[PDB]
Scaffold this motif. Sequence first.
Motif, PDB file in Angstrom:
ATOM      1  N   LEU A  62       4.050   0.131  10.453  1.00 57.89           N
ATOM      2  CA  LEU A  62       3.171   1.205   9.745  1.00 57.89           C
ATOM      3  C   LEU A  62       2.620   0.799   8.522  1.00 57.89           C
ATOM      4  O   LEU A  62       3.640   0.735   7.650  1.00 57.89           O
ATOM      5  CB  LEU A  62       3.925   2.695   9.836  1.00 57.89           C
ATOM      6  N   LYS A  63       1.621   0.487   8.210  1.00 56.99           N
ATOM      7  CA  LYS A  63       1.088   0.174   6.904  1.00 56.99           C
ATOM      8  C   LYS A  63       0.929   1.255   5.743  1.00 56.99           C
ATOM      9  O   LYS A  63       0.745   2.477   6.245  1.00 56.99           O
ATOM     10  CB  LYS A  63      -0.433  -0.225   6.941  1.00 56.99           C
ATOM     11  N   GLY A  64       1.662   1.169   4.658  1.00 57.12           N
ATOM     12  CA  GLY A  64       1.638   2.098   3.758  1.00 57.12           C
ATOM     13  C   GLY A  64       2.904   2.814   3.987  1.00 57.12           C
ATOM     14  O   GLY A  64       2.960   3.929   3.164  1.00 57.12           O
ATOM     15  N   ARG A  65       4.000   2.680   4.793  1.00 60.71           N
ATOM     16  CA  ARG A  65       5.207   3.514   4.991  1.00 60.71           C
ATOM     17  C   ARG A  65       6.240   2.651   4.899  1.00 60.71           C
ATOM     18  O   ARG A  65       6.352   1.451   5.408  1.00 60.71           O
ATOM     19  CB  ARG A  65       4.983   4.046   6.161  1.00 60.71           C
ATOM     20  N   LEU A  96       0.905  -1.018  -0.010  1.00 54.65           N
ATOM     21  CA  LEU A  96       0.031  -0.287   0.038  1.00 54.65           C
ATOM     22  C   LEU A  96       0.919   1.273   0.112  1.00 54.65           C
ATOM     23  O   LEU A  96       2.089   1.292   0.369  1.00 54.65           O
ATOM     24  CB  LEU A  96      -0.988  -0.032   1.336  1.00 54.65           C
ATOM     25  N   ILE A  97       0.325   2.342  -0.442  1.00 53.05           N
ATOM     26  CA  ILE A  97       1.032   3.584  -0.811  1.00 53.05           C
ATOM     27  C   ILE A  97       0.348   4.472  -0.023  1.00 53.05           C
ATOM     28  O   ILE A  97      -1.202   4.819  -0.298  1.00 53.05           O
ATOM     29  CB  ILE A  97       1.328   3.817  -2.039  1.00 53.05           C
ATOM     30  N   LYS A  98       0.373   5.595   1.029  1.00 56.61           N
ATOM     31  CA  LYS A  98      -0.116   6.421   1.625  1.00 56.61           C
ATOM     32  C   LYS A  98       0.628   7.739   1.202  1.00 56.61           C
ATOM     33  O   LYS A  98       1.486   7.796   0.849  1.00 56.61           O
ATOM     34  CB  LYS A  98      -0.019   6.300   3.335  1.00 56.61           C
ATOM     35  N   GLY A  99      -0.154   8.807   1.324  1.00 56.57           N
ATOM     36  CA  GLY A  99       0.211  10.382   0.912  1.00 56.57           C
ATOM     37  C   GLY A  99       0.335  10.966   2.231  1.00 56.57           C
ATOM     38  O   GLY A  99       1.387  11.147   3.031  1.00 56.57           O
ATOM     39  N   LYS A 141      12.462   5.136   4.829  1.00 55.36           N
ATOM     40  CA  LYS A 141      12.753   6.384   4.678  1.00 55.36           C
ATOM     41  C   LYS A 141      11.764   7.357   4.877  1.00 55.36           C
ATOM     42  O   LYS A 141      12.216   8.470   5.290  1.00 55.36           O
ATOM     43  CB  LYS A 141      13.625   6.575   3.216  1.00 55.36           C
ATOM     44  N   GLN A 142      10.353   6.902   4.639  1.00 56.20           N
ATOM     45  CA  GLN A 142       9.543   8.078   5.085  1.00 56.20           C
ATOM     46  C   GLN A 142       9.455   8.317   6.459  1.00 56.20           C
ATOM     47  O   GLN A 142       9.167   9.332   7.061  1.00 56.20           O
ATOM     48  CB  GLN A 142       8.159   7.488   4.476  1.00 56.20           C
ATOM     49  N   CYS A 143       9.493   7.177   7.414  1.00 55.94           N
ATOM     50  CA  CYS A 143       9.484   7.342   8.775  1.00 55.94           C
ATOM     51  C   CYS A 143      10.665   8.182   9.114  1.00 55.94           C
ATOM     52  O   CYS A 143      10.434   9.103  10.212  1.00 55.94           O
ATOM     53  CB  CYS A 143       9.392   6.038   9.554  1.00 55.94           C
ATOM     54  N   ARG A 144      11.691   8.090   8.623  1.00 56.37           N
ATOM     55  CA  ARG A 144      13.095   8.841   8.931  1.00 56.37           C
ATOM     56  C   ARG A 144      12.880  10.233   8.856  1.00 56.37           C
ATOM     57  O   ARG A 144      13.152  10.973   9.699  1.00 56.37           O
ATOM     58  CB  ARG A 144      14.293   8.250   8.165  1.00 56.37           C
TER      59      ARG A 144
END
Length: 52
Positions: A33-36, A1-4, A39-42
Amino acid sequence: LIKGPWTKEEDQRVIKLVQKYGPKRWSVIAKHLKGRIGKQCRERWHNHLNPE
Ligand code: NA
């Protein structure tokens, strides 16, 4: 999944996960975290939740 955009719930979860694992182990944190991905969390942590 991909989240915005990030939700307040996601932000709170990142805070709790960093408390547990440290501002590192991003891959491990992202598994919760679904969809993450790591690097996004970082980036969310360094740029928005815990800015310099
Ligand atoms: Na994930």
